[PDB]
mmCIF file of C-alpha atoms and ligand atoms in Angstrom:
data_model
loop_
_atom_site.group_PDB
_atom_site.id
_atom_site.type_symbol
_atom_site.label_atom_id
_atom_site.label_comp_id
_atom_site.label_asym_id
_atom_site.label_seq_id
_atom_site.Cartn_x
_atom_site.Cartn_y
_atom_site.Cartn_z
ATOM 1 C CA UNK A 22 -22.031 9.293 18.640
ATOM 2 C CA UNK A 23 -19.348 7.577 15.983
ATOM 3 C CA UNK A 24 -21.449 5.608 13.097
ATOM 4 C CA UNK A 25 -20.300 3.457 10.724
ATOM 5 C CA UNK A 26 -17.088 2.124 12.718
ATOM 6 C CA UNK A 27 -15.799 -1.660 12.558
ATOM 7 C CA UNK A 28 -15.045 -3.534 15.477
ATOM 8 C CA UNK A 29 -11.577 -4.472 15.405
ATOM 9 C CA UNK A 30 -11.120 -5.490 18.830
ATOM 10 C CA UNK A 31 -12.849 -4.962 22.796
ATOM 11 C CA UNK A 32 -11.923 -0.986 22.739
ATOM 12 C CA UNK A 33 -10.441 -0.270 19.144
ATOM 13 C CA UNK A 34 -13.040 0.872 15.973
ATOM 14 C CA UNK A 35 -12.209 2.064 12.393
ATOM 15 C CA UNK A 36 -13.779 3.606 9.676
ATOM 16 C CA UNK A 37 -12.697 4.861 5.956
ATOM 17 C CA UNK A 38 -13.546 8.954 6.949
ATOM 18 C CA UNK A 39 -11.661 11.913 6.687
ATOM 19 C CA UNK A 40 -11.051 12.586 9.892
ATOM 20 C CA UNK A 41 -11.732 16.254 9.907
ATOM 21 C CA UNK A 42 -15.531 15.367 8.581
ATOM 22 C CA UNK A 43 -15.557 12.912 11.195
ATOM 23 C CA UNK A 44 -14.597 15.462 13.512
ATOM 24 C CA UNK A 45 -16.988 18.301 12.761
ATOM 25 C CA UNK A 46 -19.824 15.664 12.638
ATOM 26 C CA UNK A 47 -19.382 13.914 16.113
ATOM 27 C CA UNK A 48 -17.440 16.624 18.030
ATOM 28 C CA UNK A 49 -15.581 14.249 19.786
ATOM 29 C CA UNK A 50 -14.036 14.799 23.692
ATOM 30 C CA UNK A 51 -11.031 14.480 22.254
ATOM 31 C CA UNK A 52 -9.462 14.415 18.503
ATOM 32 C CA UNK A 53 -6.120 12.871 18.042
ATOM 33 C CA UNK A 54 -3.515 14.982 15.879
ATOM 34 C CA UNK A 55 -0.784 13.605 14.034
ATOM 35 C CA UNK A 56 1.618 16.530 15.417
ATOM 36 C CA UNK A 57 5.342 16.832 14.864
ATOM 37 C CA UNK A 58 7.813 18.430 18.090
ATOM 38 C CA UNK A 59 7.468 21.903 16.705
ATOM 39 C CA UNK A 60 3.520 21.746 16.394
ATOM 40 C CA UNK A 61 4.184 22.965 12.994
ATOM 41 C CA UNK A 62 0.981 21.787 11.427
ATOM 42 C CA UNK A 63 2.100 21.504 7.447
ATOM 43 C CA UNK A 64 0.426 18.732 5.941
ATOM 44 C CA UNK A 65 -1.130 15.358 6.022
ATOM 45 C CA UNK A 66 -3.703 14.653 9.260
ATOM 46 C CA UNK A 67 -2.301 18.106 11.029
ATOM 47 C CA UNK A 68 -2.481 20.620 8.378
ATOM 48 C CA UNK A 69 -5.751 19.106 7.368
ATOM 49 C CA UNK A 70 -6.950 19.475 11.249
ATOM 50 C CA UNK A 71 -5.411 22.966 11.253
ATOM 51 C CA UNK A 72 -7.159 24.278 7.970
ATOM 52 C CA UNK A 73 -10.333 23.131 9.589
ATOM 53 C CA UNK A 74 -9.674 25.602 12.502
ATOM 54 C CA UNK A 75 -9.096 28.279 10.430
ATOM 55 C CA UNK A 76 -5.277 28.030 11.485
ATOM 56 C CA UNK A 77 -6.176 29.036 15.044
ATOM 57 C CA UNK A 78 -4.789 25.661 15.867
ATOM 58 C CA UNK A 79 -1.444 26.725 14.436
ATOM 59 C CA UNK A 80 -1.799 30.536 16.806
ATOM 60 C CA UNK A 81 -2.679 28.198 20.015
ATOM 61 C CA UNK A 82 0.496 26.250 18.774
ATOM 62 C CA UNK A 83 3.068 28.616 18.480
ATOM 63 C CA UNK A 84 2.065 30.205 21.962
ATOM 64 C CA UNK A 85 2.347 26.673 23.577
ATOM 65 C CA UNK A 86 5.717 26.291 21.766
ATOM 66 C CA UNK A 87 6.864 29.814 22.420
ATOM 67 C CA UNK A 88 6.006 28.631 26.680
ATOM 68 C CA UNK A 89 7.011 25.357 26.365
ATOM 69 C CA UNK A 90 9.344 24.626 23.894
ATOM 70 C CA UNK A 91 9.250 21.590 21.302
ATOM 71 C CA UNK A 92 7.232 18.124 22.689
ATOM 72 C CA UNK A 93 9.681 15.322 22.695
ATOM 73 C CA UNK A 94 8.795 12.258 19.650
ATOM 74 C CA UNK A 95 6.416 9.491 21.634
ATOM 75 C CA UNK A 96 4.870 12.545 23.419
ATOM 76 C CA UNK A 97 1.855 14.507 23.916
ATOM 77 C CA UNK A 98 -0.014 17.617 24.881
ATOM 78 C CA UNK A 99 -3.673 18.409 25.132
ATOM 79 C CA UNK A 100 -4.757 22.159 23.479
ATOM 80 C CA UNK A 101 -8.279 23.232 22.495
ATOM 81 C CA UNK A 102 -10.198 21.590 20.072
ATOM 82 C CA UNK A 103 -11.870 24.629 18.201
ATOM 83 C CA UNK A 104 -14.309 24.121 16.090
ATOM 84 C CA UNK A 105 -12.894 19.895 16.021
ATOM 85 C CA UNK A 106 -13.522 18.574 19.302
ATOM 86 C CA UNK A 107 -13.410 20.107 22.778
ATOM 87 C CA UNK A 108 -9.769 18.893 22.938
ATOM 88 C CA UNK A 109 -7.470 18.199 20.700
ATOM 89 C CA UNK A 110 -4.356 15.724 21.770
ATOM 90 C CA UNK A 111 -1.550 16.504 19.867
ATOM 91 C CA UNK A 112 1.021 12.993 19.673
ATOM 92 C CA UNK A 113 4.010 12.811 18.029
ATOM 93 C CA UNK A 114 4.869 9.640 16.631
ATOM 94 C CA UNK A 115 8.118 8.386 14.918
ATOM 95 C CA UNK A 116 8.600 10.141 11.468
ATOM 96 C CA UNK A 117 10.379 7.337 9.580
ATOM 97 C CA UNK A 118 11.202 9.398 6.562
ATOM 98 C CA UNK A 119 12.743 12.502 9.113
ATOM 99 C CA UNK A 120 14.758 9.235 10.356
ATOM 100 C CA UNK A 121 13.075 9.071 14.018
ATOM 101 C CA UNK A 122 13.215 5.902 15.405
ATOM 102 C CA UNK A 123 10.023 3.837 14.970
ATOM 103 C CA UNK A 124 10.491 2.192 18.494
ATOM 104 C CA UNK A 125 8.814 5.125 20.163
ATOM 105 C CA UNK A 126 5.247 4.361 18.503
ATOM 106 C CA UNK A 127 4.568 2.605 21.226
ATOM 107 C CA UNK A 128 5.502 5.430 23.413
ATOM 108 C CA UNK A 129 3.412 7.499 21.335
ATOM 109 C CA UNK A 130 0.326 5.087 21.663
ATOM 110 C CA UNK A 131 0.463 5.024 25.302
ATOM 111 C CA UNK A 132 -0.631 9.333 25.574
ATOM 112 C CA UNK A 133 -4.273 7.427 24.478
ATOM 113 C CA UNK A 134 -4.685 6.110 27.257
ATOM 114 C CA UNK A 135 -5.097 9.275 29.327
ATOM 115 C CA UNK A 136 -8.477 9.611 28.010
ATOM 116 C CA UNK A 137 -11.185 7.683 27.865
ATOM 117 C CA UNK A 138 -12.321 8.050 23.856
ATOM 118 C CA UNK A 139 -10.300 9.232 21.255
ATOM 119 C CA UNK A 140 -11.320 9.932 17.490
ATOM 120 C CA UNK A 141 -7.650 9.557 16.258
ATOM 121 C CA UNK A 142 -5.747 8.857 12.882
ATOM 122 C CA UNK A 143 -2.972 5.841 12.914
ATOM 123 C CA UNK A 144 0.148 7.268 14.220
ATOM 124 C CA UNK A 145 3.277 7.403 12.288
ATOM 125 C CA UNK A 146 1.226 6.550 8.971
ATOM 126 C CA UNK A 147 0.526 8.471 5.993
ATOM 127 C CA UNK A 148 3.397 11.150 5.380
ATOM 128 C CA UNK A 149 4.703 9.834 8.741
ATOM 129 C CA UNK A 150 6.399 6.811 6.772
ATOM 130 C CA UNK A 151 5.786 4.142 8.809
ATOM 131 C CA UNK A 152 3.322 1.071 7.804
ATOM 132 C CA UNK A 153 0.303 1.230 8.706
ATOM 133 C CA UNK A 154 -0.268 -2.219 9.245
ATOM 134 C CA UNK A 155 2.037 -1.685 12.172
ATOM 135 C CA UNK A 156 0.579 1.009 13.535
ATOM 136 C CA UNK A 157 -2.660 -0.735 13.763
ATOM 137 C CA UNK A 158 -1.199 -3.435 15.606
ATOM 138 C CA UNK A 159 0.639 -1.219 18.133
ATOM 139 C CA UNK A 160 -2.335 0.531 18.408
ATOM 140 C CA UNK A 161 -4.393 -2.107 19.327
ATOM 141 C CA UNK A 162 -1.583 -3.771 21.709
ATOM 142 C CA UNK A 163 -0.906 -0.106 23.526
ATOM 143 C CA UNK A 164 -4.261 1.481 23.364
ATOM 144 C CA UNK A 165 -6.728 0.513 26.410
ATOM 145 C CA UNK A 166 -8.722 3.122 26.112
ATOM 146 C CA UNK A 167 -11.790 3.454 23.533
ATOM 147 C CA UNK A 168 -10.048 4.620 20.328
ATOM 148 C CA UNK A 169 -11.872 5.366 16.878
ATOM 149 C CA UNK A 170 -9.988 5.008 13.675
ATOM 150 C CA UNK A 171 -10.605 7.356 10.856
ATOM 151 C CA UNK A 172 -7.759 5.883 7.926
ATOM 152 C CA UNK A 173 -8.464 8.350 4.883
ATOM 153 C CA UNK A 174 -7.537 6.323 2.279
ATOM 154 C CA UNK A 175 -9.875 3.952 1.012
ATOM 155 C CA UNK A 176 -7.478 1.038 -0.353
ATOM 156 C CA UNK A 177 -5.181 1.474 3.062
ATOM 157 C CA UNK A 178 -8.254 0.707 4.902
ATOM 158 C CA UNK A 179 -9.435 -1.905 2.844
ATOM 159 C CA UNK A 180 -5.850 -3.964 3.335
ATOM 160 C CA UNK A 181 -6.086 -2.661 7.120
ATOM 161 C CA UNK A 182 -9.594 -4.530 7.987
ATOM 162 C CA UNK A 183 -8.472 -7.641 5.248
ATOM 163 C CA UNK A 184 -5.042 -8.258 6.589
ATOM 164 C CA UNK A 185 -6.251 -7.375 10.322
ATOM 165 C CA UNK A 186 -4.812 -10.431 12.919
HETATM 166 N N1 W3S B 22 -8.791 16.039 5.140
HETATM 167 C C1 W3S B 22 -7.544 15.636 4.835
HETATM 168 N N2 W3S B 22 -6.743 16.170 3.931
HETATM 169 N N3 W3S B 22 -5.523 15.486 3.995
HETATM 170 C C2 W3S B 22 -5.648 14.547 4.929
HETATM 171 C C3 W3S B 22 -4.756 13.563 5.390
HETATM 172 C C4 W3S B 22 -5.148 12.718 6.394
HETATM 173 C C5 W3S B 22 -6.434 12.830 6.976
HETATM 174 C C6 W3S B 22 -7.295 13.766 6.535
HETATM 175 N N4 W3S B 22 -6.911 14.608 5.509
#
């Protein structure tokens, strides 16, 4: 099971870990990406995710896309986990440096709570834009669901646990 996780609240954990370690060495239900609309899994927590898959997260991807069409920012959809997880839950939160509108993390939180445990990165964080400090405490105010924090950085998660109300 997850080792090494703080207890920030009843249901919500973290942990400094590179989520993609984290992921290949507990093999979660469910792994939490950091996806944009187009599933277009560049950088930060997604292309990290994807390189881990080999980029067969990117083929399932573009398929869903090319059925589906774009997800909408706050939302969610659940694709295979590969080699991750047995699913992976793609969520789109509020890219504050694209200009979305950082109101929908909330909305974004709220796909968590469809499943019971989640491995997941903060949402909206790292190349996202958004603080992180915030996204900790929507998480925790949104999330009622069992959620495990993997925050990358060291120093973020060090002000994260310190600063934690
Ligand atoms: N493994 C890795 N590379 N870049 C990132 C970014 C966020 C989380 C994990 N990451």
């Amino acid at each position: 099971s997850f080792s090494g996780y703080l207890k920030l609240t009843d249901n919500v954990y973290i942990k400094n870990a590179d989520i993609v370690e984290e992921a290949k060495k507990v093999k979660p239900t469910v792994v939490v990406n950091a996806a944009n609309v187009y599933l277009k899994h560049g950088g930060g927590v997604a292309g990290a995710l994807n390189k881990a898959t080999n980029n067969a997260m990117q083929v399932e991807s573009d398929d869903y896309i090319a059925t589906n069409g774009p997800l909408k920012v706050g939302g969610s959809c659940v694709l295979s986990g590969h080699n991750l997880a047995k699913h992976c839950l793609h969520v789109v939160g509020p890219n504050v440096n694209k200009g979305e509108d950082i109101q929908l993390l909330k909305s974004a939180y709220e796909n968590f709570n469809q499943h019971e445990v989640l491995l997941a990165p903060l949402l909206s964080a790292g190349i996202f834009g958004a603080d992180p400090i915030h996204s900790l405490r929507v998480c925790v105010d949104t999330v009622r669901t069992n959620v495990y924090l993997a925050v990358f950085d060291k120093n973020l998660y060090d002000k994260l646990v310190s600063s934690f109300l």
